[model samples]
Target: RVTMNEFEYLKLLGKGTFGKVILVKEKATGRYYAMKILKKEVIVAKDEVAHTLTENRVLQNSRHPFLTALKYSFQTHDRLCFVMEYANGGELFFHLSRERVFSEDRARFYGAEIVSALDYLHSEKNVVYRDLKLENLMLDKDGHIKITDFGLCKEGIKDGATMKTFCGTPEYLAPEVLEDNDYGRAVDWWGLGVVMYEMMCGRLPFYNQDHEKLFELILMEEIRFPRTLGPEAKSLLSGLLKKDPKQRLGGGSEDAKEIMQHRFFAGIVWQHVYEKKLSPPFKPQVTSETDTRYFDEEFTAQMITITPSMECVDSERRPHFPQFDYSASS
Candidate 1:
């Protein structure tokens, strides 16, 4: 059995607006894990109590190969905690920036895996990763995709109706979301189109320095396929990048099933993909389970500490949230 007190801090994995990710070693099993310490006050101040709650809820509920599932969760004073599997293979963008572009075969493999991930999240998990950027998608030691962050996730959306909320583009936000209109799982496919295009084209299908220039282009502008882009890939890209939600490939009722049917992914065996039977196109080169080579030295080299600001002292000031603690192995 293990609790928050049972882990020893090892390294700093990352820090964001809401919290910081620390790498911890479990004393009981000598296993490495990534932990999150989020201040409950900030959750209330930012009016994200429900969002954070659902974020934590989805992590506990989801158990898929592509999503980084939670192992343990607990609370202390005024902070909610999370311990999850560490993705040592690094961010997908890290490798993408270095590779410049990938071959069609390589791109297809990654695309197939991503589709499986999105399908699992939407159809099974009943949630949506509103911001599905390359930075959020990480690689594992075996070169498999791991969805690391779920902070921006919206739950209870099992495709019953469109979720309407105004959120700006994370460079991958769909036109429907940008329009602040009724959008469902269909919005997710648009971003996938952008991601697939970015992987194969070596740049954004919709790119401009000016914010105004970008939104307008993403709203109605079509992606101009490169000379060497294949017909199947080009066809799939166009279908996914469509401006109208109904026109997008995944806009249909079948959700991700529509994208999987594309000719570009014709060879992807869904069972093999879900079972992880097919070997990934790129296996990360790592020496050990705790190797920091795959991650950015900027994050891995920082001193480890849990600051006071990340926790609350006043007992009455703390907001109560019931049923937050969890231990998966138990």
Candidate 2:
């Protein structure tokens, strides 16, 4: 029953390759939401029809506390719109960019939540989240993590199954992925290691501005840990970044559970995290339920404009735009 007219546009949240996300408030319920608006032309030009469909399907079925929940999806003749949960706290990338690094305690907290989410995705949903980076992580009002961006997600991938796509950001890619070898869920663990290392050391472990050199380093170089990293943290990173998929943490029968038991996650009560009973390290400054103060001014400053009455897909391209129908859990 929900339609685009039912929500009042507020402000722009962010923009990406496919589309721009805006803030909106439901007129009937007075609830705020993030509306992702994807242009029809871009979707077709980028050959992302299947990826777009998969993103919606995965979001509709995979609901976890640490994962952003999709509320509704409906499309116009020229654009696809998704109504999603509005995380007032903004992105984790914003905080990391400002701080350059996080304390071990803070890193552990965020890392633990990500582990739980990944575990749920791999074990319960049979999905492989190909992209895992700080930029894709958002924070709720309480600063708890919410994993977003499912465009690169692959579903129905059972354990031991392999994927060969050379996807994900350069800095966080696994060795096998750079080598073009068949990879499985283990690639995510390597990305986790890179993120943790960045948090602990204030920089990516194998950073290179040159694309080819970056790939070379990922495949051939040894990971160096700072003297500041504790034994537990070092051990966890080493296990995760192991080049061989068979030797990587979370790559075995137990998956994420195996990584969760590492000494780095000692004293973490995962149950409390799942229920959001644990206190967050930081709470976002929200003036009102619809406040946009926490988000970057670069985005929030942009005015939300009316969707252009662009040409509808012609008969030739209509087949590519599959109908989208999804409703939130009651």
Candidate 3:
């Protein structure tokens, strides 16, 4: 049976609202993985049961080149554990932070990869990966994209369906989502524009120190292009940043098809990207298969621990979790 004893902790990856991620190595194969330890009490108390379950659902269903992969899942008295893909190249944001900005060539490659991943999530799985950010976009040793953080995903988002969750980071949110209006997968397209713009320009298209005003800014202001942007880049950004979801790049019947055909992606072949036939623009330093240099020093420096916190372990709702154990390697 799968259990915590199967793996040895290496370093802390990160901590979040639900739990923490740690770099780990399997004793059986010495293969690296991220042990995402979810605190059951925190999940129950925060009413995030739906999100946690859906994340597992997405990870299990996911089989794409650019998406995170889950190996095994198991549970203990106080926690839920997911042994998932550990992208040794680290978070895309970390690379961008160190480099300041990327050239159009690199940005386009990343954008194409992201588009391929999001398109698959939308069309194949009927899921909306509501969380789209540089931090969520990780890099493997080969420097290819590995989209992570599945907690905010919303499944069953078919062509005719809509949802009303005010999800996503403020700067990356589309105008419609910021207003609490009913939206669909198009929100992810808008977020792609925001992320791409940041990649190319090193700043947000709309932002303000005042929290509420930022929402208004997204609605009120028109996105201004930099002289550095090429004509194709300018058009792609505007098409995606369109405030009207009805007019946004992926807002219609064709979905990501509209964005994929844009001139900015003139050289990209979707199939080649999905197949990883094209070489990535950069490769992260990897001393060994288990190297953790690309990850943040803050997390790697911390003491590794997986003992479930006991803050709310005795919650009446936590007696037992049904149908939670899943295994594959065994």
Candidate 4:
């Protein structure tokens, strides 16, 4: 049911590993949105089946103020498309990287929102987002945070089994993942630790260009604070990066609430936060209404000139690709 018309394709926002994000305008209401289109074959070819499923699962059940919300989802002949709410605000990294870092209070405020969102996911929904990097966060029109890219999300522990998968960006990988232990929802807290550190310092605590070398550093190296970071920020990051999964803050038996109540976020008011009472420490640069135009000449040329046939008359949905099934279960 997540359908659009010829006039809907407006602009191109950006592209990702296996997908392209475009801004679209609804012909009927003249409203705008950003749609991400992913090549199913490409994702499957990359052995990211669980990643794809996790993204779908997160979108299907997500409901939080700071979490990215999906407008709808459907499949095209060439791609699986997810039509998501368009947030005009730019990435948090853009500002953080430019400023070189953030103050302790600023980091705490943002971290609190992220932890709150993660808590709702792990506690209420039992979903664990293996990947929770700064790039996965977005700012809404009102400046509240919105977590995006659920491709790394999955259900938490099943019985006593821990999920074993090698995913996520290098600098953000958790120690439990490095140890090859059965990991569950706790992995998110580890990522939050990395984010917290990055927020205070422009560079990550663990840095290496080589993939193998990076993993080695993440596991073997001790937590290091830049000369500038305050004691409170350093202490919080230390707790988050604990090697023992069970002892890591908010990773195991500890709830998100427990981490939120840490000294770092002592003065944060959750009610006011949800209501968008406080202004964000850093904001993005959005010049004109067309600044977020997600489509260009190339994308417009690719719009479905004529609507494709939706008929199920042919038993074999595809004349080619014998292994393909059009009637995939939701």
The per-model lDDT (C-alpha) reads 0.80, 0.85, 0.86, 0.71
What would the per-residue lDDT of candidate 1 be over residues 219-243, giving only the tens digit for each residue?
Answer: 8786798899999999999999888
Could you give the C-alpha RMSD of every candidate to the true structure, in order shown?
2.6, 2.0, 2.4, 4.8
Candidate 4 lDDT, 221-269, residue by residue in tens: 8888888887778888998988766777775455576687778777888
After the best TM-score superposition of candidate 1, give how far the Cα of residue 209 lies from its true spot, in angstroms: 4.1
Sort by lDDT, best first: 3, 2, 1, 4
Report the lDDT of model 1 for residue 89: 80
Q: By TM-score, how accurate is candidate 1? A: 0.91
> Counting only residues 3 or more apart in sequence or on different chains, how many pairs clash (N, Cα, C under 3 Å) in candidate 3?
0
Least accurate 10 contiguous residues by lDDT in model 1: 308-317
TM match of model 4 to true structure: 0.85
TM-scores for the candidates: 0.91, 0.95, 0.94, 0.85
Tens digit per residue, CA lDDT, model 2, 89-200? 8987788888887888888888998998998999899999989977888898778998987989988899889898788888888999988868899888998898888888
1 or 4, which is superior by lDDT? 1
Q: Which stretches of candidate 3 lie over 4 Å from their true place?
A: 308-319
CA error at residue 143 for candidate 3, angstroms: 0.6
Counting clashing residue pairs in each candidate, in order, gives 0, 0, 0, 5
